[PDB]
Amino acid sequence: SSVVGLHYKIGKKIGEGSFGVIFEGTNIINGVPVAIKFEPRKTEAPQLRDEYRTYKHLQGCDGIPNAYYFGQEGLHNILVIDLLGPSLEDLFDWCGRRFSVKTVVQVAIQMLTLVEEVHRHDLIYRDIKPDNFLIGRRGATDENNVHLIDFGMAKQYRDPRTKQHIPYREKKSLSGTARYMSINTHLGREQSRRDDLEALGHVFFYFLRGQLPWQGLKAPTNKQKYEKIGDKKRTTPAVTLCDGLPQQFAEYLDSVRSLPFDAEPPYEEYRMLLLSVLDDLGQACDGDMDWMHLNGGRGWDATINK
Template sequence: MTTHVIASSSNAVSSGAPTFVGNHQFKVGRRVGEGSFGVVFEGVSVANGTPVAIKFEPRKSEAPQLRDEYRSYRTLAGTSGIPQTYYFGQEGLHNVLVMDLFGPNLEDLFDICGRKYSLKTVCMLAKQMLTRVQSIHEKFLIYRDIKPDNFLIGPPGSKTANVVHIVDFGMAKHYRDPKTKVHIPYRERKSLSGTARYMSINTHLGREQSRRDDLESLGHVFLYFLRGSLPWQGLKAATNRQKYERIGEKKQTTPISELCESFPEEFAIYMNYVRKLGFEETPDYEFLRELFSKVLKAAGEEDDGMFDWVLLNGGKGWEASVKKQSSSNHQRRDRDRDRERHRERASHQALAPTTPNITARTSTAGAATGGDANPSPLVLTPAPAHVSSRRDRERERDRERRRLDTQGSAAAAAAGVGGSPMATRRSSAQHVANAHPYASTTGAVHSQAPSAFRPGAPGEAYAYGNGSVNQAPGRQRAMTPNTGNGMDMNRAQMSQSRVDRRLEDGRQEDEQHKGGFMSLICCR
């Protein structure tokens, strides 16, 4: 979940959240957003008035993330660009995390800036984002969900107003054991985790993620910022699984030269470098940062913090755009609320009972007209006893007949009548993964035209790009063994209804971002 300073008008009381949390240390204020995993409120420290973000997650959540996210923040405590946490605990039926409050995320700012960033802004962002990811890797963690929504700038007017922060560690995982320093083993047939638009090719192929995959995802984000979109956006397919297969195929068959066409060669160098990294290989982060410093120097620019959003509105910055849009949104919400109330009133009037007592009404009407209006008023009387008994017996016979028919159908299905035996259906789902082309640290290159592209393993539980899981028929859910601190979202046993809700999110991987900067928050 991503925190913003832009907030809606709903408060804690109207949303059912407690007024105070953390033993009355923090007062809960306006709700700033919600998602499939919980709700986030703006709050304030009672002791010193410091603004904070307060995340609420149901304790009975099907895929709890907040505790694992809190553990990641503790591991990274004191690292520049990482939120500071102030409290984690249980409040009634919720897990609660109190942390720093930030400004808008890079996707929101991307919308404000017309859905393209200048070359200077992309290079300055790239250097900061690389540093954040390097800091995470140095703590033996991989992030596994790189996307613009999870990078936020600081609060407006603060010293960190143009410092990029990274948040939402619900899918982070140790790639080395913190005690033994042993790297996790390479594995295949892994379910997908991350956001399909930005995830690495290896992730699409169902291969265990490591540091190289975070860096490849970053490269996709950089090119998204420069181009305005990526070649694999907007692909259509009959099912979500097929859609993600098509995205993976398009990534593999799109040459880097085409992906980086018309941009400085350093972007192609970056993509070639990260895609050739070995599974356990340590990236040269300084070399990668230097690539973007060279681009800035060649363009006659400096890394001075003057991002595109700072120059908006005649130098007033992005805040002026937010205030204007916020006022417009409030007016639109008021109009929508008035229309909804009008529809509800009309609906109630249409459904209101107009004949509560048929006998009384018809009798009264007849009396008022001298008996001519309704000479034979309708009177409802119970049926005779012998008629009721016969009807009851007929209903009972119908119920028994339906029950026997249902049992017969179930028995036929169990015997395999009219369908494939379970063994046949299971065997048809088997899949032998291709050998990993660079499991060692030699840095082999992806084949550009794989003979058979399959993300994960057909027939196994298949986690979609946002970390949710689609249960395959006849299979148990795939449970990824916990490594290190065990922060692997693939262990989440999520219901299909939640998967469907998340796959319909307006910020989903293969569609253009439509939420805009007023979407406020991204709960992932």
């Protein structure tokens, strides 16, 4: 059948997110474009239904798309959400694998706000990477704002009613993306709010430099590769990552790395820290982004870029 969930016509496949089977589509009642993620209906570790509830739990938060349907349709499981634009990894590539300091600050404060409101709903994200932060669609209100998708790695970190934190714990299996994950993750420690923020600091330097110094390491196995990346993260001072860059990014990474395990990070203080970079450089926080100058001032386009 060309239509799932009663109302959603399946369209072009876009197969992001685990190669994890995503299509674009349209709501046949109101023309609203949607993203449709299928998932094999029987699985050991099915994430689609708790991902649906995660979107509902975060419903109304800015930068988090609506979920309109989760259901059946025979062979798979379906989740329908708002359709968004390219990822920050995509735009990073099209901009030459380098973001200006201005673009990094502006995207950083929106990412900090996104993660904060995930944390405010008693969840840690635990899969921070530029591939899961998406901009909006062209000619939309939110075309160039950052959004957050894919909550398959999310976990409750405090009880919602009592607000009491999960116990600290160790010897957890290392999974996530090794390029960005916190040092604590490398050591098998239970993740918490600070670890989402340390991962963000890694992305910030990734954007600013074009590369992180623990990229391109090799080992016989994956486990040993993860260990070498973790070793590099701990012998590279934040001040050397930020050689030639505004020192507020080194102070950011240093401070979130030293946060206590259950501590509530000072999100607004971190945002003011990064905002001060623009003041030291005489720039304004006006929403102008590097990718908005792509292709003569038209921005990203499918024929030329991807």
